[PDB]
């Protein structure tokens, strides 16, 4: 069972005793610190504070139990006993904490502030910093979705250049990713917030997530086609990927199918089996029901122009209203091997120098899309900026003099938009003043409450691309 | 609740209808492919069997969910219903899949089969694939011990070369990752992997997941020190840094504790506060009570060299029995940003050069330790190798002509140790002969039931340097 006392990084058992005497209010907030990355999606903490932060999170038994691991744990009794025992009997387990937050799928420029947290009781000075940890790692989603977002911007680009218009974007990235990430939980956080800015997904786990802890009115907020994987291409026999083939392109023969096709050798397989041995099997399908041929392997640029140069030859190309090269209806291919951010701005640029429209490809992204990502591409970071000590406050920070990009913001903040619609995180409690409009940061938990929800379908609109 | 059914890849729900008919077996195997990490260290199987894969993990309220969820996940009734409730019915919802596996902490040279997938049960040949996902996940924890044990070998000889033994060495590589990995539970399995080399963590739910899953004789497996962060340092004022660094000493006086030093000039905290202003508190502290000093910005290496040369001139330095520099036994660093293998190595080998032993530090290291990690780092891949169909057993096989490093096994497989100590994977059944002796795969799962298990204290000793 979770336990929030056991939650947290090791030393901050011992800060309690290291904070000025007579502090009664630590507030710390969250950005995307300033160091191409320029706005951030705000998405993922909804689901931390209904997963591990809201109701009694406190009890007897967790306080025993972290004070029996920190015994040990430190050699030592340091762990604050008294303090979590206040919480349980003051506030039935409930934390005396505020949190303020920009609403989820807001996108906001980097160096702003996104939450804030605040403890609510004087005697839980030390509770700001404590869920420090456990909030931080909201950095997972909210990068997720913000390079999630920039690939959707590089599909739409490329997209409304070689075909007029934005038809199927939602479903031109697709989510692969689900063996390729660290664990069942991140998969289904990753996937959610892939699914901010798309519609296709093989991560399941993502689907469970937003429907227990945002919820969605379309039947389901992701979605996949049948399809192949070499196993069941490669049990045949490698004398029989045909048979293969023509097996599971005829049980699915009314439904989009894709089957991966470089087993033993893609071009091989894209020449003589799909077009010309099977070819009487394709030509025969439905718009609605398209075979998609996958690639796998090998530099994916230069596989996908190989692969469309070869069907171009076998299978009759039209030319869409733009001018760029179409494939016949019922053919497309996904590229789902090596995408990343850069590798997929190569291959559609490289299709668009071919004249070959971006309405014949679609992507799938695994590890680049949910794994090979770290807290340092959006220096999110967390940071007392605040305190109040024996009455007084205090605009506190940081500002190391060998790294001036690690500098923290002071005082009470606030979120603003500007008349010409930038944005400004207003510092040392100047959002008192009202120069601008509201505080666009809104009490999203209070005292063991969360205040404010959003559904998906909110942060998908919030998000959406100019 | 955790679903099973729900736990795959979505393309996987659809394969029962492409395998050949009549297909009455499907064998997969896990390796860590052939083409730095020439050996990885096994780990982290057994929490997934424990957590996903045993018992009753097929009930008919979980067949309805699943159901229920990919018929609107693929706009189609494609959900094999009756594969699921054959399992429920027949074995009361255990899985008819064994599972043989390397012991857990035996180091393996890549390209070797680590464990094996089968069903047991004919009408099942389906379910070897669909855990695939799950299973292939064991990539984190393998490829974490792997890389934290890699970083164990460059401060073993570090070490040894410029003090002339390993003492401390099991505490030199510090887990800070908590706020820097991806979800709750990648934290918890990370940071178990790591502990397999080390013993000192922050990431408190490492400790948990090794007590239910595995075990250790000691009460814990890993420790900490009491320790400041910025927030406990710039609450103070930005005029009392030296006010805080005094009250954090003075309340951990008699334990180590590491105190953050940079927050607005690192370099002045060594040379004026630690160096003069509080130097009396630091020189009467115990051997077993070193104050350490945190740098935490700027560049790595010369941030140490920096420090280090300040507080040489501060504090009696020595010179060991290998010539090297050593700070008083009062007084330690430890560098805790931008620690990841390849900084690690730059940095002791900046130290070796300019003389300062490597008794004098150790590392945090954050995301280059749990995050900045992916699949293809050892080339963690599922593959299968083995199948029958109408009785007749076929070797199978995937060889992309443009990636020969795709190519996979054939046939059934087994793991023998030589005469010489190596290891070697025989392949198409032919290890019955045993020229080197036992298969080193032990059945681990099988038919619903763990069947073998090792402690935490076993898989530390496996994974050992020479
Ligand atoms: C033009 C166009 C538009 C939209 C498309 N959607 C797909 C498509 C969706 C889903 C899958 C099935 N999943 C996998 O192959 C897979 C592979 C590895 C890991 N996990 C899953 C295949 C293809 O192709 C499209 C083509
Ligand atoms: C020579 C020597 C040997 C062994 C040592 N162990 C430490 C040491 C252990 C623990 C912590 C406290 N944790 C953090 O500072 C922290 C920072 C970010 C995220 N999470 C935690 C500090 C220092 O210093 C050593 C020095």
């Not at 809201?54 to 040990?72: L, S």
Request: proline content about 4%.
């Amino acid at each position: 069972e979770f336990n929030i006392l056991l939650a947290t990084d090791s030393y901050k058992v011992t800060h309690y005793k290291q904070y000025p005497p007579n502090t009664s209010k630590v507030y710390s907030y969250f950005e995307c610190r300033e160091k191409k990355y320029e706005e951030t999606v705000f998405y993922g903490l909804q689901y931390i504070l209904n997963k591990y932060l809201k109701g009694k999170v406190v009890t007897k038994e967790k306080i025993q139990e972290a004070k029996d691991v920190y015994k040990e744990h430190f050699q030592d009794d340091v762990f604050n006993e008294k303090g979590w025992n206040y919480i349980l009997e003051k506030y039935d387990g409930h934390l005396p904490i505020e949190i303020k937050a920009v609403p989820e799928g807001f996108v906001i420029p980097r160096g702003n502030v996104l939450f804030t947290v605040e403890n609510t009781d004087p005697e839980c000075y030390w509770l700001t910093n404590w869920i420090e940890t456990i909030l931080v790692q909201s950095w997972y989603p909210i990068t997720v979705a913000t390079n999630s977002r920039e690939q959707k911007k590089i599909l739409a680009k490329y997209l409304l250049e070689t075909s007029g218009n934005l038809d199927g974007l939602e479903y031109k990235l697709h989510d692969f990713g689900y063996r390729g990430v660290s664990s069942q939980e991140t998969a289904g956080i990753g996937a959610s917030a892939h699914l901010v800015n798309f519609k296709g997904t093989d991560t399941v786990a993502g689907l469970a997530l937003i429907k227990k802890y945002y919820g969605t009115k379309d039947p389901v907020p992701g979605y996949s086609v049948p399809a192949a994987e070499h196993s069941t291409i490669t049990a045949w026999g490698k004398d029989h990927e045909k048979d293969a083939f023509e097996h599971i392109v005829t049980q699915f023969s009314s439904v989009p199918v894709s089957v991966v096709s470089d087993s033993y050798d893609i071009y091989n397989a894209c020449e003589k089996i799909w077009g010309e041995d099977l070819r009487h099997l394709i030509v025969s399908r439905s718009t609605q029901a398209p075979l998609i041929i996958r690639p796998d392997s090998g530099n994916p640029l230069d596989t996908v122009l190989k692969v469309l140069e070869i069907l171009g030859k076998k299978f009759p190309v039209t030319e869409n209203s733009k001018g760029y090269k179409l494939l016949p209806p019922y053919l497309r291919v996904i590229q789902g091997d090596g995408v990343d951010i850069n590798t997929l701005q190569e291959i559609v640029e490289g299709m668009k120098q071919k004249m070959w429209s971006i309405e014949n490809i679609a992507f799938g992204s695994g590890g680049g899309l949910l794994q090979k990502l770290t807290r340092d591409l959006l220096n999110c970071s967390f940071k007392c900026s605040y305190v109040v000590t024996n009455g007084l406050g205090i605009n506190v920070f940081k500002d190391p003099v060998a790294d001036p990009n690690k500098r923290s913001k002071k005082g009470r903040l606030s979120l603003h938009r500007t008349p010409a619609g930038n944005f400004v995180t207003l510092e040392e409690g100047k959002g008192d003043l009202e120069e601008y409009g509201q505080d666009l940061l809104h009490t999203v938990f209070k005292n063991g409450k969360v205040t404010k929800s959003y559904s998906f379908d909110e942060i998908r609109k919030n998000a959406q691309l100019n």
